Design a binder for this molecule. Structure first.
Ligand SMILES: C[C@H](CCC(=O)NCCC[N+](C)(C)CCCS(=O)(=O)[O-])[C@H]1CC[C@H]2[C@@H]3[C@H](O)C[C@@H]4C[C@H](O)CC[C@]4(C)[C@H]3C[C@H](O)[C@]12C
Ligand SMILES: C[C@H](CCC(=O)NCCC[N+](C)(C)CCCS(=O)(=O)[O-])[C@H]1CC[C@H]2[C@@H]3[C@H](O)C[C@@H]4C[C@H](O)CC[C@]4(C)[C@H]3C[C@H](O)[C@]12C
Ligand SMILES: C[C@H](CCC(=O)NCCC[N+](C)(C)CCCS(=O)(=O)[O-])[C@H]1CC[C@H]2[C@@H]3[C@H](O)C[C@@H]4C[C@H](O)CC[C@]4(C)[C@H]3C[C@H](O)[C@]12C
Ligand SMILES: C[C@H](CCC(=O)NCCC[N+](C)(C)CCCS(=O)(=O)[O-])[C@H]1CC[C@H]2[C@@H]3[C@H](O)C[C@@H]4C[C@H](O)CC[C@]4(C)[C@H]3C[C@H](O)[C@]12C
Ligand SMILES: C[C@H](CCC(=O)NCCC[N+](C)(C)CCCS(=O)(=O)[O-])[C@H]1CC[C@H]2[C@@H]3[C@H](O)C[C@@H]4C[C@H](O)CC[C@]4(C)[C@H]3C[C@H](O)[C@]12C
Ligand SMILES: C[S@@+](CC[C@H](N)C(=O)[O-])C[C@H]1O[C@@H](n2cnc3c(N)ncnc32)[C@H](O)[C@@H]1O
Ligand SMILES: C[C@@]1(C(=O)O)N[C@H](C(=O)O)CS1
Ligand code: SF4
Ligand SMILES: [Cl-]
Length: 346
């Protein structure tokens, strides 16, 4: 019964059986109680501040061929772009002028910049007195080391799926073992490290989602990015079903219950599949938002999945928009860089 699973969640009996049951029960009352629990845990542990991470998607060039992604190398129906280093630094400076306290640099796996142009960019942005987060994919340890010496603070590398068989099929250039070794390398190097997964991938089961939760719990990641799979028409998964918003929301809620002091975004993918999806997610465990700061005309070309929000507006609108969102939610903007503030437990 839902009441019993909620009691075990409240007492932190996080067995594979309790997590499977939580993901399998579809009762409205249960789901609402789960979401309330995750919202309360978020308040108690990370408070009312919603941390703003301004994301600049600086290149859509990619060497990899992930089956779900619109930027996959085999997609010829996509205009590719690269921002220049000066364009990236100035665009970061504009986000700092708008009050962003973290700059996220994200791209496909684009060899051109790696590793020294990235290091030069990172050093320039760090002079502005903000946190820098990189989300550039899988690279040699040496590249990660250089970027840390250059001043990068955090690195986002979603584990995508903890099922190694499904991982290798969806990501045929690599492996779960490679992905995990990159995450472990990043943590050893002193980055605050983000993982996370997609929900509703073709062939992914509920048991797979339980394994994603336990993986996350096992490694105690500082950040966890979770969103639905959204099929992209220029990919091999074009005709597969999109991930369910409610199930994805439950994954967010459980992540917060499992990792109470972690930083968890309300992702753009959540706001794409349901109107208002980010705001709901911020009330079910999330405490971070990532306003799109990619300038036109490139913004519209970072087509990972179709329907992406925030593309038709003036390119300086997102930061103010998320500040209004935070206020109407009765929350507060982040006062510092919003690094993880661990609460040591027993
Ligand atoms: C309480 C009022 C008025 C009911 C009435 O007509 N008086 C009704 C009118 C529209 C209803 C919402 C929508 O249904 C969307 C959604 C369906 C979910 O399933 C349950 C939650 C939610 C948000 C509903 C909640 C509530 O039920 C609302 C606000
Ligand atoms: C805003 C709506 C509908 C409220 C409503 O319309 N309910 C009838 C009127 C009730 N009022 C008290 C406003 C007046 C009562 C007098 S009356 O005579 O009208 O009935 C309520 C109904 C169910 C609520 C969500 C669930 O909890 C799950 C979850 C818990 C988290 O923690 C916060 C996030 C989330 C998503 C909640 C948000 C929000 O809160 C919802 C949508
Ligand atoms: C960039 C330009 C020109 C001047 C400039 O280059 N300004 C650098 C400010 C740098 N910081 C943000 C670090 C200041 C923090 C001071 S604070 O006292 O807020 O800590 C300035 C002039 C007016 C400023 C907006 C308004 O104000 C309203 C609103 C206040 C929010 O809050 C942040 C968002 C927003 C939209 C502001 C963004 C930006 O800023 C604007 C556009
Ligand atoms: C109205 C839209 C569908 C719009 C459409 O596409 N038509 C549907 C899709 C997902 C739904 C929410 C989620 O289930 C989570 C949560 C469950 C609680 O029980 C009641 C509140 C809440 C926020 C739901 C409200 C509403 O029902 C949503 C927004
Ligand atoms: C300029 C645009 C329009 C409006 C819409 C919502 C407004 C913000 C919120 O009101 C919350 C907060 C109130 C504080 O007082 C000062 C700062 C802050 C972040 C506001 C700044 C600015 O005023 C915003 C961005
Ligand atoms: C596009 S990549 C850029 C960063 C770096 N290339 C990497 O893969 O880590 C960022 C994330 O987008 C997500 N994503 C890609 N395609 C998606 C899709 N079709 N639907 C939902 N999310 C997707 C994946 O979870 C991936 O980690
Ligand atoms: C920035 C990112 C994340 O969760 O870190 N969100 C993106 C999105 O939801 O579109 C994909 S990767
Ligand atoms: S998910 Fe990242 S690595 Fe895979 S194709 Fe897309 S941009 Fe390239
Ligand atoms: Cl971050």
């Amino acid at each position: 019964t839902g009441r019993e699973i909620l009691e075990k969640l409240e007492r932190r009996e996080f067995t594979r059986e309790v997590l499977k049951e939580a993901l399998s029960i579809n009762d409205r009352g249960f789901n609402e109680a789960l979401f309330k629990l995750a919202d309360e845990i978020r308040r108690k542990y990370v408070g009312d501040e919603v941390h703003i991470r301004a994301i600049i998607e600086f290149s859509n060039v990619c060497r990899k061929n992930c089956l779900y992604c619109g930027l996959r190398r085999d997609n010829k129906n996509l205009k590719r772009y690269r921002m220049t280093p000066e364009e990236i630094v100035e665009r970061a400076r504009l986000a700092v002028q708008f009050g962003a306290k973290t700059i996220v640099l994200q791209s496909g796996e684009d060899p051109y910049x790696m590793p020294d142009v990235i290091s030069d960019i990172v050093k320039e942005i760090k002079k502005m007195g903000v946190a820098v987060t990189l989300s550039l994919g899988e690279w040699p340890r040496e590249y990660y080391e250089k970027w840390k010496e250059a001043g990068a603070d955090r690195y986002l590398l979603r584990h995508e799926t903890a099922n190694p068989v499904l991982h290798r099929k969806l990501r045929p250039d690599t492996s779960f073992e490679n992905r995990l070794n990159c995450l472990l390398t990043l943590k050893e190097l002193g980055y605050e490290t983000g993982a996370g997964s997609m929900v509703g991938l073709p062939g992914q089961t509920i048991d797979d989602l339980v394994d994603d939760l336990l993986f996350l719990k096992e490694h105690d990641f500082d950040m966890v990015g979770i969103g639905p799979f959204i099929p992209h028409p220029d990919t091999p998964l074009a005709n597969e079903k999109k991930g369910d918003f409610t199930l994805t929301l439950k994954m967010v809620a459980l992540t917060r219950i499992l990792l109470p002091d972690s930083n968890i975004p309300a992702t753009t993918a959540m706001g794409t599949i349901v109107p208002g999806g980010r705001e709901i997610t911020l009330r079910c465990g999330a405490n971070v938002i990532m306003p799109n700061w990619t300038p036109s005309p490139y913004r519209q070309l970072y087509q990972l999945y179709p329907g992406k929000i925030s593309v038709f507006e003036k390119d300086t609108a997102s930061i103010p928009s998320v500040m209004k969102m935070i206020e109407l939610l009765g929350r507060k903007p982040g006062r510092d860089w919003g690094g993880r503030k661990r609460v040591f437990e027993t």
